[PDB]
Amino acid sequence: SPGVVISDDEPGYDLDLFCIPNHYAEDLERVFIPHGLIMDRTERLARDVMKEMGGHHIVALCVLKGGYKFFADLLDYIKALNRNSDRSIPMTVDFIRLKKVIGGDDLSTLTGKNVLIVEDIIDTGKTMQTLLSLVRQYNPKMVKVASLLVKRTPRSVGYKPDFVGFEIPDKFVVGYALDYNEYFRDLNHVCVISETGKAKYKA
Amino acid sequence: SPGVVISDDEPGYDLDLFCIPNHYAEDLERVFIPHGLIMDRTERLARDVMKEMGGHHIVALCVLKGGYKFFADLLDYIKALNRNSDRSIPMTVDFIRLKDDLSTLTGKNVLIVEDIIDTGKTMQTLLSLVRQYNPKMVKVASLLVKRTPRSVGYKPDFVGFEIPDKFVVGYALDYNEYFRDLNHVCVISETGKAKYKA
Amino acid sequence: PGVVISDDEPGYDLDLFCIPNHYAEDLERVFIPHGLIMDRTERLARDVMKEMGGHHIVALCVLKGGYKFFADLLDYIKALNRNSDRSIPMTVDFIRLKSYIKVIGGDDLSTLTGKNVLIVEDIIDTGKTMQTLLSLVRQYNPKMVKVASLLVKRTPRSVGYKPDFVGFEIPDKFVVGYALDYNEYFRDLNHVCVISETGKAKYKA
Amino acid sequence: SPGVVISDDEPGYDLDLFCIPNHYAEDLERVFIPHGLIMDRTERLARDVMKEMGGHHIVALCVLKGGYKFFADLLDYIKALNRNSDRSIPMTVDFIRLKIKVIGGDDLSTLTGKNVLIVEDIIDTGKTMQTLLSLVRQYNPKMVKVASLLVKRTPRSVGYKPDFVGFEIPDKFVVGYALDYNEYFRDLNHVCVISETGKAKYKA
Ligand SMILES: Nc1nc(=O)c2ncn(CC(COCP(=O)(O)O)COCP(=O)(O)O)c2[nH]1
Ligand SMILES: Nc1nc(=O)c2ncn(CC(COCP(=O)(O)O)COCP(=O)(O)O)c2[nH]1
Ligand SMILES: Nc1nc(=O)c2ncn(CC(COCP(=O)(O)O)COCP(=O)(O)O)c2[nH]1
Ligand SMILES: Nc1nc(=O)c2ncn(CC(COCP(=O)(O)O)COCP(=O)(O)O)c2[nH]1
Ligand SMILES: [Mg+2]
Ligand SMILES: [Mg+2]
Ligand SMILES: [Mg+2]
Ligand SMILES: [Mg+2]
Ligand SMILES: [Mg+2]
Ligand SMILES: [Mg+2]
Ligand SMILES: [Mg+2]
Ligand SMILES: [Mg+2]
Question: Active-site residues (chain C)?
Answer without folding.
Answer: 125 (proton acceptor)
